[PDB]
Design an enzyme around this catalytic site. Structure first.
Site, PDB file in Angstrom:
ATOM      1  N   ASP A  17      -3.677   5.163  -3.508  1.00  0.00           N
ATOM      2  CA  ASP A  17      -4.188   5.407  -4.858  1.00  0.00           C
ATOM      3  C   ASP A  17      -3.363   6.428  -5.621  1.00  0.00           C
ATOM      4  O   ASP A  17      -3.901   7.407  -6.145  1.00  0.00           O
ATOM      5  CB  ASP A  17      -5.647   5.869  -4.809  1.00  0.00           C
ATOM      6  CG  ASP A  17      -6.345   5.766  -6.173  1.00  0.00           C
ATOM      7  OD1 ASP A  17      -5.725   5.276  -7.141  1.00  0.00           O
ATOM      8  OD2 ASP A  17      -7.525   6.153  -6.269  1.00  0.00           O
ATOM      9  N   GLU A  47       0.206   1.375  -3.840  1.00  0.00           N
ATOM     10  CA  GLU A  47       0.085   2.277  -4.990  1.00  0.00           C
ATOM     11  C   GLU A  47       0.801   3.610  -4.799  1.00  0.00           C
ATOM     12  O   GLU A  47       0.304   4.680  -5.204  1.00  0.00           O
ATOM     13  CB  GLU A  47      -1.370   2.509  -5.335  1.00  0.00           C
ATOM     14  CG  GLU A  47      -2.101   1.254  -5.730  1.00  0.00           C
ATOM     15  CD  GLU A  47      -3.430   1.546  -6.393  1.00  0.00           C
ATOM     16  OE1 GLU A  47      -3.535   2.576  -7.102  1.00  0.00           O
ATOM     17  OE2 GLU A  47      -4.367   0.752  -6.187  1.00  0.00           O
ATOM     18  N   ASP A 157      -3.021  -4.438   1.024  1.00  0.00           N
ATOM     19  CA  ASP A 157      -4.249  -4.469   0.244  1.00  0.00           C
ATOM     20  C   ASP A 157      -4.316  -5.828  -0.406  1.00  0.00           C
ATOM     21  O   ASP A 157      -3.618  -6.083  -1.383  1.00  0.00           O
ATOM     22  CB  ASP A 157      -4.261  -3.348  -0.779  1.00  0.00           C
ATOM     23  CG  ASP A 157      -5.495  -3.352  -1.641  1.00  0.00           C
ATOM     24  OD1 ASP A 157      -6.400  -4.175  -1.387  1.00  0.00           O
ATOM     25  OD2 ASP A 157      -5.555  -2.518  -2.576  1.00  0.00           O
TER      26      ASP A 157
END
Ligand code: MN
Ligand code: MN
Lengths: 255, 248
Positions: A17, A47, A157
């Site tokens: 993130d 990310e 992911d």
DNA sequence: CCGAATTCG
DNA sequence: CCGAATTCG
């Protein structure tokens, strides 16, 4: 890691993130403390942003970093120096992505075995199901195209809903999901859980198995040993390293 | 030789609603159909129709919110009973409204609905369509069944249903899929929602069940195509005018 | 009542 | 990066 552990590959896959700038350096230190605790051979990240690469170079310096792009946000594969020999990097485009997603592959030798290690951050949200499914097909096709001597591991992911894998043609016959392989253990089923994780501050309880591991194996040559969640401890700032939990996996390469 | 109009008249749009209701009825007056199936009627709209269409028997699918109605021309259509069937999982107060009627010696079961709206509610719309198709099969064989309403259907959704059953026909399909009345919701031709893109759908449809060749569609036409004084249309939907013959 | 975007619980 | 509700184009 010594003689006894030489048949095993261990890795973490984790969407960390990097698009959340708040507390990012501290949260990067949290991720790196996890890496130091388990010392995985390989780390699959999603990310990542360029500042995050600098944090990894500082607090995870024993890993070589291979990235999926230069700007914005992207994936990375980290390779433990001294264990993993880097042979090449491949990037496969997702021509219809609206979120700069792609497929990052690194070919390596580890433990006297050739690997193709792959990661992606498939198109996000329910609304982009159709594109996510197309990307999943791209991933699965690439897994099949690898030479038969090579051991193929995808970890990333996927943003998948269970119905979507069924729409795709299921996993192909020689491709397996590590969590499924291990009997669908409840303790690491959900990798994104807004009840247990408050980083996004979503005032509702939803949970998904977004993060997944696929591997290709002919006749028992790759056997998952364990699968566990990481990143479940709040840091000093009172937040988690990410809105996702990470996955720690060990697999044995068998004759 | 029986005629009807089916029309979602968008009573939920408050803008120019009085003028647009009057516009709907000006159109109805031009064709004087035996039957009118309406969707998105609201209570003050229904009050208006009870006066404006006092020459019709008016059956409604609800008394609050927004709902369907079936209007039956007095002297032409004998009203025998009404039945309302719930859609237990609707989130939009949708249901199935049926009336048993006769025209002369011919018994009819006439049905309308406003199936669950928007692409995201496809699954519930399909369940509702199955309820409609099931109910169509229940009438005695000597009764002519006509459904006309706003189905919000995509073609693919009817396929997901398994297709129309062998004894149920789409009137637009029956007439050879005429191009001039294909699309009943068309944002290129209709500006009421002010959607700045061109999308068109055959949302409004007519299904029928009759003993082999007892009910024969003769014509199908769009109505409500003229802009009103306010520069908007009576509704975001076009209406469908259908004439059919019963052949014994 | 389209499809995409956005806000907010 | 949920999902219902809302707005935007
Ligand atoms: Mn994210
Ligand atoms: Mn409407």
């Amino acid at each position: 890691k010594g003689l006894e552990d030489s048949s095993t590959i261990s890795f973490i896959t984790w969407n960390i993130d990097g698009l959340d700038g708040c507390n990012l350096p501290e949260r990067a230190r949290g991720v790196c403390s996890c890496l130091a605790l388990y010392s995985p051979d390989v780390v699959f990240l999603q990310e990542v942003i360029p500042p995050y690469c600098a944090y990894l170079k500082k607090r995870a310096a024993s890993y070589t970093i291979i990235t999926g792009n230069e700007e914005g946000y992207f994936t990375a594969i980290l390779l433990k120096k001294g264990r993993v020999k880097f042979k090449s990097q491949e990037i496969i485009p997702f021509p219809n992505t609206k979120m700069m997603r792609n497929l990052l592959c690194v070919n390596v030798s580890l433990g006297g075995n050739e690997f193709c290690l792959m990661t992606s951050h498939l198109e996000s949200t329910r609304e982009h199901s159709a594109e996510r499914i197309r990307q999943l097909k791209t991933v699965l096709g690439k897994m099949q195209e690898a030479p038969d001597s090579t051991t193929v591991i995808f970890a990333g992911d996927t943003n998948l809903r269970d119905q979507e894998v069924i729409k795709c043609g299921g996993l192909p016959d020689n491709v397996f999901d590590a969590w499924e392989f291990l009997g669908k253990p409840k303790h690491c089923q959900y990798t994104w859980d807004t009840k247990a994780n408050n980083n996004l501050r979503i005032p509702a309880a939803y949970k998904h198995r977004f993060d997944r591991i696929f591997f290709r194996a002919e006749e028992g040559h790759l056997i998952p040993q364990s699968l566990d969640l990481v990143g479940l401890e709040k840091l000093d700032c009172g937040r988690f390293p990410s809105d996702h939990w990470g996955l720690l996996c060990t697999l044995n390469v068998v004759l």
